[PDB]
């Protein structure tokens, strides 16, 4: 019943009270403990006092305006507090969100107009506060975002976000975009979809426009002033209630469609959002809100929420704040870029570089090939002009920065080089030597290499310091990670210049010390090799792909093993064998190698040849190859599906630990985001490093339960799953 966290037995005040002569009360949120307003214990007590006062002085108050005295309106729940909630804390979590929503429900039912003055970003709990208001005005300023991105952290909008958005838009419309995706909207789009009712040019216009709306509202409709649509007697939920025959006919398909989108992955947040949405739409607003609290407490006390909060809030902010950037270095603006190789990698680097606003020179071994690389940027802009995302004036200024050439003289004035030629050290030595002298002196010399160490590639140029590894991923237009590799003679100043370039093209950087396979290529190899081994063991190919998808991967492994050329995977298998036999050792081959060579013997080496594990007709997958079952005697091995899933997840998590032991990675954040944004590690794990400390199965939860399952996997499928000594004790 109370608006406060305690009812027995000293927080800071974050709300400023101001009642004007008309009776309008302005609640200005200004948390003095940080640069943003969050739902910590200070806000709860501050809003509790304010709402108590709004009720006590109800006879002398005519309207309320909720505003913020910071760049952002309100940033939502305190992630630093929510990530510590244990299963035993389910009662405290439930009471906190009930108290938070008790305050908003009182604000929502005062009988007076309440307007939200959204100056900046209002995300999560911030938008939930604004959704409790009867009218929302947002300043159309730069950088302002609005949305409920709780699902991206493994949570749900538990401060009335699920309940109110369903009352506003219905079950289907609220779930499809703002809830299940957690998408962030610019204020102009927020006004279009209905999350915001009015826009203004600047933030100074907000409170005046808010107070003017209150004065007009009290005159145009005094009976409905301060009464949300769902608090009126004739309320009709958009799309209908779960008892409506129209919605009831399509409702059984919502969990199955959601099951299809998630491919069976163990991500409980969208499942709980959908349950709270439908269950809430069956009862009154207050009962619906309480149901929302219980589903929120089941997520926050869970483990997936811990992983996703760790990776997609803490680890991602540490990266975007210069955690990998060394010491302090001034910025060096990039005037022109030169891409070597017009393949799908080089053409993708040319598109993302020009889309950021850089002049690019795309060179190849002929003009015929350089134009087919620029055609990769044209085909994307043709599909982007139909969806309405890009304009014709900008799409032309974008493709104008891509100059397809075949002459090395066109690289004059290039102060940033990104090579993407074939995986051959002598070739990379050659193509860099023709240009090392044509480019400007302090030009960064980058190489989009998969496995070849950058230290050995740097000897092909004169300035060893400006040589650096700039690993992009296929396709470059979508993949958001750039793996910056540091050679032995790579300077810290070149490390920062590529760090700044990655942030300029809107991508996330990780810093990796030089080694064969780097971090991404080395780990993603263990993932695909574990699946090929299952195929050689006789496991059904359809079960292998299903185990890969239900693990949370964005692409099943055999399908991914066709995108990556099986010729390329065999080259890596020869290098690792030659390196061990040149030192006198006995190379122990991975069981996948016999499958790779058998498929090449059969002439099915991947999608490039049009034949691999799948069949490829007219440039599209036509299902698995029927002869694959006879070749490997599929069906003879039927292991548990969870045993297959763990084998793929554990192979990567263990190899990520080796990369941490060997010093390839210097931070777990780079390991987590690097695996998530680079090689598609399942987001619910929080990363391949978080998967160790956050493993959850029948054995239990924690690093101890990870080792037990790792040893259980080692005893049944091979000693490669034996945990390293760093994980022990």
């Amino acid at each position: 019943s109370s608006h406060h966290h305690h009812h027995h037995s000293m927080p800071d005040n974050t709300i400023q009270w101001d009642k004007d002569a008309d009776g309008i009360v302005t609640l200005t949120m200004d948390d003095p403990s940080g640069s943003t307003n969050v739902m910590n214990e200070a806000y709860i007590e501050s809003m509790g006092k304010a709402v108590d006062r709004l009720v006590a002085e109800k006879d002398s108050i005519t309207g309320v305006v909720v505003a913020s005295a910071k760049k952002t309106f309100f940033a939502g729940g305190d992630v630093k507090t929510m990530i510590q909630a244990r299963p035993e804390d389910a009662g405290d979590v439930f009471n906190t969100v009930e108290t938070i929503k008790r305050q908003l429900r009182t604000l929502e039912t005062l009988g007076k107009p309440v307007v939200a003055a959204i100056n900046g970003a209002a995300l999560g709990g911030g938008l939930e506060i604004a959704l409790a208001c009867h009218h929302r005005i947002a300043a159309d300023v730069k950088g302002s975002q609005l949305g409920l991105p709780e699902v991206t952290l493994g949570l749900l909008p538990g401060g009335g976000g699920v309940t109110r958005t369903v009352r506003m838009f219905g079950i289907q419309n609220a779930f499809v975009s703002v809830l299940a995706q957690g998408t962030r909207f610019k204020p102009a789009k927020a006004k279009e979809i209905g999350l915001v009712d009015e826009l203004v040019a600047t933030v100074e216009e907000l409170v005046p426009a808010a107070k003017a709306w209150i004065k007009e509202e009290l005159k145009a409709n005094p009976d409905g002033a301060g009464v949300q649509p769902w608090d009126k007697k004739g309320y009709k939920m958009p799309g209908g209630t779960p008892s409506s025959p129209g919605l009831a006919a399509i409702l059984p398909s919502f969990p199955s469609n959601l099951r299809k989108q998630l491919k069976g992955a163990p991500m409980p947040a969208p499942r709980a959002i959908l349950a709270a949405a439908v269950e809430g739409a069956q009862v009154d607003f207050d009962t619906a809100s309480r149901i929302e609290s219980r589903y929120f407490a089941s997520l926050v006390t869970g483990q997936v929420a811990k992983n996703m909060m760790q990776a997609f809030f803490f680890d991602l902010q540490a990266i975007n704040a210069g955690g990998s950037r060394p010491e302090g270095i001034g910025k060096t603006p990039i005037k022109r870029i030169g891409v070597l190789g017009a393949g799908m990698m080089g053409a993708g680097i040319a598109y993302v570089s020009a889309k950021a606003g850089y002049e690019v020179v795309l060179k190849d071994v002929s003009l015929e090939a350089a134009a087919k690389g620029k055609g990769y940027s044209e085909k994307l802009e043709a599909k982007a002009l139909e969806r309405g995302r890009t304009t014709q004036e900008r799409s032309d200024a974008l493709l104008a920065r891509i100059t397809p050439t075949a002459d090395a003289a066109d690289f004059k004035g290039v102060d940033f080089v990104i090579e993407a030629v074939f995986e051959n050290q002598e070739l990379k030595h050659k193509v860099f030597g023709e240009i090392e002298d044509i480019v400007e002196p302090n030009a960064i010399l980058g190489s989009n290499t998969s496995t070849l160490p950058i230290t050995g590639l740097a000897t092909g140029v004169k300035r060893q310091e400006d040589f650096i590894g700039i690993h992009f991923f296929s396709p470059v237009d979508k993949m958001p990670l750039v793996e910056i590799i540091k050679g032995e003679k790579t300077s810290d100043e070149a490390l920062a210049r590529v760090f700044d370039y990655t942030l300029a093209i809107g991508k996330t950087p990780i810093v990796v010390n030089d080694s064969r396979g780097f971090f991404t290529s080395r780990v993603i190899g263990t993932f695909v090799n574990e699946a090929l081994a299952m195929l050689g063991e006789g496991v059904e190919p359809a079960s292998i792909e299903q185990a890969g998808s239900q693990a949370g991967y964005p692409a099943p492994p055999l399908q991914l093993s066709d995108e990556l050329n099986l010729e390329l995977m065999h080259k890596i298998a020869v290098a690792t064998r030659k390196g061990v036999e040149d030192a006198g050792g006995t190379y122990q081959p991975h069981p996948a190698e016999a499958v790779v060579e058998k498929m090449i013997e059969l002439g099915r080496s991947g999608r490039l040849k049009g034949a691999g594990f799948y069949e490829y007709a007219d440039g599209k997958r036509s299902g698995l190859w029927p002869g694959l079952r006879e070749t490997f005697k599929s069906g003879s091995s039927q292991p548990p599906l969870q045993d297959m899933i763990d084998r793929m997840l554990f192979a990567e998590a263990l190899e990520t630990q080796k990369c941490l032991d060997e010093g390839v990675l210097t931070s777990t954040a780079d390991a987590n985001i690097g695996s998530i944004m680079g090689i598609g590690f399942p987001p619910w794990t929080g990363g391949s490093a978080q998967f160790i400390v956050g493993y959850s199965g029948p054995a239990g939860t924690g690093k101890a339960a990870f080792v037990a399952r790792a040893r259980e996997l080692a005893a049944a499928y091979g000693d490669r799953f034996l945990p390293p000594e760093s994980l022990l004790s």
Binding site: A248, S253, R259, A275, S543, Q546
Partner: protein, 402 residues
Amino acid sequence: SEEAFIYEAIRTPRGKQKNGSLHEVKPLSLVVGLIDELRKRHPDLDENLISDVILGCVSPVGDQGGDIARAAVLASGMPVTSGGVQLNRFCASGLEAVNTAAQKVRSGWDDLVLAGGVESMSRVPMGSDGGAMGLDPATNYDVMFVPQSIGADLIATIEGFSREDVDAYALRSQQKAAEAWSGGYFAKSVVPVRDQNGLLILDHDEHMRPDTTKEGLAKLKPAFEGLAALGGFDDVALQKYHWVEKINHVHTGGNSSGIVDGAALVMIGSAAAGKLQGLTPRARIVATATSGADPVIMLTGPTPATRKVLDRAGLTVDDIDLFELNEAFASVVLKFQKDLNIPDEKLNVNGGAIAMGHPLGATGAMILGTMVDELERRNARRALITLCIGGGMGVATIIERV
């Protein structure tokens, strides 16, 4: 303990879903008509010795709500002590009622029970009653809810039944049902529906397409390809059946059970009940059983239920003269025939639901009374009736001629 006997087993003609003859007939009126036919066959029966009226009904809402069994008792003027209870076990409801009635008689605490079912699918469509398994996301997500149709397509996929194989069974169902009507097999049990003035409304299973050809069945479009695509039920099924790569959608509107209206009534009682009322026993309930299989492939239920009732009655497949499995989907009958090695000349010898229709609540009682008449016409002993059930259930009954 006390043996249960079938004394009467009648049904109504099955009117079709679109422009059906029985669409103007309330489901309560279908049941009362069968009660009145029982009175016409025994005008001196002391109805006070009737202990209960059990009716299966899968959508007990609207015209079929409020305990339609009790409504049947009160509307037909039956004694007010005659009870009236509605049960719902999906497709088995018609047979589960008869089994429950038989089990009531066996306990000695009931003497004479009316059992059967009613389902007017043209008036009360399937799913009108809602349900947690489908309309609650937390359960629909925990359980792997997939409609009956995809499970039927998945059966044909795993077991290797082609589109021509299921159309082949759909053909012989139409042929055997048409030959049964021509030979007059159904003249005694199919009670024509009449209005309050005695005028005829329907006297035949108007869903039958007796001139069906193998070429016409091949022209039809797979009727369950848009459902599994717009709802993603195909992907949900294959997440549990991961070794299956793709589902072959072979089931159409011509090899699947038809949506129809109908009702059935079975009079079950003890031996003493028949002697006191002059009723002549027609068959004896030998044994009943209830089992099930995987819920995603929910139509594999009848296989373990049949084995359980055979073991309970102390019989084997060779001891059964006639097998009657509801033709919900053609692949369901083919898998059941394949598992138990059912001789084709013993399986649904008078056609089934593909030809005549599947009134959910009444089908079990309809096909039971079908075997009562067929065992007598052939002068055979034992028949085994079973139905595949949504949610993965299964019910089987064994009768013996008397």
